Amino acid sequence: VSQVRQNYHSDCEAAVNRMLNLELYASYTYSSMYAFFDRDDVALHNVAEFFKENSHEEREHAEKFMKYQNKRGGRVVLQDIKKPERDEWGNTLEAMQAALQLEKTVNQALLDLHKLATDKVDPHLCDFLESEYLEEQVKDIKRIGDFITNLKRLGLPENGMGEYLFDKHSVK
Amino acid sequence: VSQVRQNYHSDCEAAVNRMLNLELYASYTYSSMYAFFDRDDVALHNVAEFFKENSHEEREHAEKFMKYQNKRGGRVVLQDIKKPERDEWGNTLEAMQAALQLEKTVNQALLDLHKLATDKVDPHLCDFLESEYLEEQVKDIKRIGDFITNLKRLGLPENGMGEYLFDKHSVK
Amino acid sequence: VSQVRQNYHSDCEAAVNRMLNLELYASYTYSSMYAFFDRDDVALHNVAEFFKENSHEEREHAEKFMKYQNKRGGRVVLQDIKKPERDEWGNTLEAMQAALQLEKTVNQALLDLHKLATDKVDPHLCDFLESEYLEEQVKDIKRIGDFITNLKRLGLPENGMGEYLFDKHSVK
Amino acid sequence: VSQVRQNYHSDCEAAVNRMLNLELYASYTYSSMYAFFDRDDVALHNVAEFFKENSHEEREHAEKFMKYQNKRGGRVVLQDIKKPERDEWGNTLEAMQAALQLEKTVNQALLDLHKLATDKVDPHLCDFLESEYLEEQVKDIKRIGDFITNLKRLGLPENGMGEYLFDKHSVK
Ligand SMILES: [Cl-]
Ligand SMILES: [Cl-]
Ligand SMILES: [Cl-]
Ligand SMILES: [Cl-]
Ligand SMILES: [Cl-]
Ligand SMILES: [Cl-]
Ligand SMILES: [Cl-]
Ligand SMILES: [Cl-]
Ligand SMILES: [Cl-]
Ligand SMILES: [Cl-]
Ligand SMILES: [Cl-]
Ligand SMILES: [Cl-]
Ligand SMILES: [Cl-]
Ligand SMILES: [Cl-]
Ligand SMILES: [Cl-]
Ligand SMILES: [Cl-]
Ligand SMILES: [Cl-]
Ligand SMILES: [Cl-]
Ligand SMILES: [Cl-]
Ligand SMILES: [Cl-]
Ligand SMILES: [Cl-]
Ligand SMILES: [Cl-]
Ligand SMILES: [Cl-]
Ligand SMILES: [Cl-]
Ligand SMILES: [Cl-]
Ligand SMILES: [Cl-]
Ligand SMILES: [Cl-]
Ligand SMILES: [Cl-]
Ligand SMILES: [Cl-]
Ligand SMILES: [Cl-]
Ligand SMILES: [Cl-]
Ligand SMILES: [Cl-]
Ligand SMILES: [Cl-]
Ligand SMILES: [Fe+2]
Ligand SMILES: [Fe+2]
Ligand SMILES: [Fe+2]
Ligand SMILES: [Fe+2]
Ligand SMILES: [Fe+2]
Ligand SMILES: [Fe+2]
Ligand SMILES: [Fe+2]
Ligand SMILES: [Fe+2]
Ligand SMILES: [Fe+2]
Ligand SMILES: [Fe+2]
Ligand SMILES: [Fe+2]
Ligand SMILES: [Fe+2]
Ligand SMILES: [Fe+2]
Ligand SMILES: [Fe+2]
Ligand SMILES: [Fe+2]
Ligand SMILES: [Mg+2]
Ligand SMILES: [Mg+2]
Ligand SMILES: [Mg+2]
Ligand SMILES: [Mg+2]
Ligand SMILES: [Mg+2]
Ligand SMILES: [Mg+2]
Ligand SMILES: [Mg+2]
Ligand SMILES: [Mg+2]
Ligand SMILES: [Mg+2]
Ligand SMILES: [Mg+2]
Ligand SMILES: [Mg+2]
Ligand SMILES: [Mg+2]
Ligand SMILES: [Mg+2]
Ligand SMILES: [Mg+2]
Ligand SMILES: [Mg+2]
Ligand SMILES: [Mg+2]
Ligand SMILES: [Mg+2]
Ligand SMILES: [Mg+2]
Ligand SMILES: [Mg+2]
Ligand SMILES: [Mg+2]
Ligand SMILES: [Mg+2]
Ligand SMILES: [Mg+2]
Ligand SMILES: [Mg+2]
Ligand SMILES: [Mg+2]
Ligand SMILES: [Mg+2]
DSSP: OOTTOOSOOHHHHHHHHHHHHHHHHHHHHHHHHHHHHTSTTTOOHHHHHHHHHHHHHHHHHHHHHHHHHHHHTOOOOOOOBOOOSOSOOOSHHHHHHHHHHHHHHHHHHHHHHHHHHHHTTOHHHHHHHIIIIIHHHHHHHHHHHHHHHHHHHTTTTTOHHHHHHHHHHTOO | OOTTOOSOOHHHHHHHHHHHHHHHHHHHHHHHHHHHHTSTTTOOHHHHHHHHHHHHHHHHHHHHHHHHHHHHTOOOOOOOOOOOSOSOOOSHHHHHHHHHHHHHHHHHHHHHHHHHHHHTTOHHHHHHHIIIIIHHHHHHHHHHHHHHHHHHHTTTTTOHHHHHHHHHHTOO | OOTTOOSOOHHHHHHHHHHHHHHHHHHHHHHHHHHHHTSTTTOOHHHHHHHHHHHHHHHHHHHHHHHHHHHHTOOOOOOOBOOOSOSOOOSHHHHHHHHHHHHHHHHHHHHHHHHHHHHTTOHHHHHHHIIIIIHHHHHHHHHHHHHHHHHHHTTTTTOHHHHHHHHHHTOO | OOTTOOSOOHHHHHHHHHHHHHHHHHHHHHHHHHHHHTSTTTOOHHHHHHHHHHHHHHHHHHHHHHHHHHHHTOOOOOOOOOOOSOSOOOSHHHHHHHHHHHHHHHHHHHHHHHHHHHHTTOHHHHHHHIIIIIHHHHHHHHHHHHHHHHHHHTTTTTOHHHHHHHHHHTOO
């Protein structure tokens, strides 16, 4: 019943709230990875800062969904932000593998929201996802995949010298 | 039979001409609102200038449809620009309510043209509407809705002090 | 057993993790207030931006506790970030009253952590709280109290003109 | 009997002189590490310069205690600066392990002086230690711990290539 609401299905409104939550969950997982790589017994500061920056990006993505919801006349409904799946992330390779799976989980949720928007004939929501989320996700998945290939080439997890070299030449 | 024409359905060509006319109609309605708020017995100059700027925006939107029509090899066909529904617009709240309904009428026509372009499998016309019209319409509807909420909060239509305050702090 | 750990009690390590969580909870509550004041049927954008900025400040406070934990050789342990107490915040006065109580809840948790650090004879943790958190909390509580006094003076919750005036002259 | 003396216990005056001596001892140990890494048969110049800079920092810390003593009306009493525990420091890992233990010895002496100042109700001396010494010590211990983690990852002491890489990418 919002005065601005036009062509905005209840199902899309709810799916935007769920997508908002998933972006916040992804942010929190990257915060955990930042804190792990900043541990004195891990101490890979460029890796830590890579994940801290990703945490900020995902929070920005969540805030853009809040703004979107209000622009369309939907109502932001928040739920708990679940803690990350792990308390410790092993090493740079294990963390990047977890980041790749997280990025693909977020991408699948964005693609599913695009399919719902398509089914409800919502071109504005389709354009928003295509213009503000789907290309960044493909770029992020490619970047992380490239890093995993390099970490395997550098002999992770066993090769500690390879892990050091990655921190000093791939994320400086 | 234009040498440039490719994947451009006659129905979409005609609907672009009708959409062009509606943009010119919207421009003319905003011109009327400008002239009303510039009356000596209305005298809300920042409100008048808000509507004058919207009149120019809608004329620009119409000219972009003329250029689009020619780029695709369609032919611009003009019809009369109907005078606005009212000769006088009451007060800032009544005018903003009329502007919200006008913006939603224009938005519905753009969404209907997007559905026709989708049915005729015209991705260029879909992209044009998504990239050049649909996001501006959502932003404009949100802005006007926000203003209506504030005018009601300020006690319009009865509260003349509230109307003055809006002119001096919301559209300066 | 961290190689850096010195004079850092397990109880203080755990209380820092709980304090981290409370800062994230406070951030999330301010995010909710931002989204509420950005609604088309609320539409107090300077109030919304005040709360959005507070949301960012509290996230920064949480990240500083993560860095602190690692500097001392403690281990960051994350828990769920609980959703805010309300889904809607009434009006500027109700939201500022909720913000004052939230700031005093955070302040009481910081004072309780300072008392634990005092009992465990941890001057570094005491100094950190005194230098990085306790003075900002007193300033924030004073600012919000001052705003509540002004909102009451302006006739909130009933006086919508007063609410408009506050948005346009106290948080611009 | 100094005209400036107020709330300055004899025990704190003596403990400041002992703390002064320990800072000079720490400076001298870092001087020894500088000279070791500058040897032609060691030749890790960035490591050498790291330790030379730490030697200067500790001398500055000692001079600040001399100034403090005089500000409070105590009297500087100097003792011999004992030569460092070792004449040669093995390799970058052995030296960093010795530096970590030295930093924790200095930190424990600062914490013990803070406890004495607390027992004698000397808030000025407490503030001085908290503001000028205790946070730098936590930062220094964290930095050295992080370096030790990286040197172990790089295969020290056996992996000479790892030692070279550290000199060229961690302390450049
Ligand atoms: Cl709708
Ligand atoms: Cl529709
Ligand atoms: Cl619906
Ligand atoms: Cl929902
Ligand atoms: Cl659950
Ligand atoms: Cl785990
Ligand atoms: Cl995942
Ligand atoms: Cl969905
Ligand atoms: Cl054609
Ligand atoms: Cl085709
Ligand atoms: Cl055709
Ligand atoms: Cl036509
Ligand atoms: Cl007619
Ligand atoms: Cl009329
Ligand atoms: Cl209309
Ligand atoms: Cl149509
Ligand atoms: Cl300890
Ligand atoms: Cl101690
Ligand atoms: Cl303990
Ligand atoms: Cl814990
Ligand atoms: Cl619970
Ligand atoms: Cl509620
Ligand atoms: Cl609270
Ligand atoms: Cl506590
Ligand atoms: Cl005295
Ligand atoms: Cl005294
Ligand atoms: Cl005495
Ligand atoms: Cl002495
Ligand atoms: Cl002796
Ligand atoms: Cl020796
Ligand atoms: Cl030592
Ligand atoms: Cl002492
Ligand atoms: Cl290299
Ligand atoms: Fe994202
Ligand atoms: Fe991403
Ligand atoms: Fe990204
Ligand atoms: Fe338009
Ligand atoms: Fe597009
Ligand atoms: Fe418009
Ligand atoms: Fe516009
Ligand atoms: Fe004013
Ligand atoms: Fe905070
Ligand atoms: Fe104190
Ligand atoms: Fe605060
Ligand atoms: Fe603040
Ligand atoms: Fe020192
Ligand atoms: Fe130090
Ligand atoms: Fe230092
Ligand atoms: Mg309504
Ligand atoms: Mg619904
Ligand atoms: Mg979910
Ligand atoms: Mg759980
Ligand atoms: Mg793009
Ligand atoms: Mg690349
Ligand atoms: Mg021809
Ligand atoms: Mg035709
Ligand atoms: Mg028409
Ligand atoms: Mg007629
Ligand atoms: Mg766009
Ligand atoms: Mg706005
Ligand atoms: Mg260890
Ligand atoms: Mg413990
Ligand atoms: Mg808690
Ligand atoms: Mg719950
Ligand atoms: Mg005490
Ligand atoms: Mg201060
Ligand atoms: Mg003030
Ligand atoms: Mg004398
Ligand atoms: Mg004496
Ligand atoms: Mg001594
Ligand atoms: Mg001797
Ligand atoms: Mg300090
Ligand atoms: Mg560091």
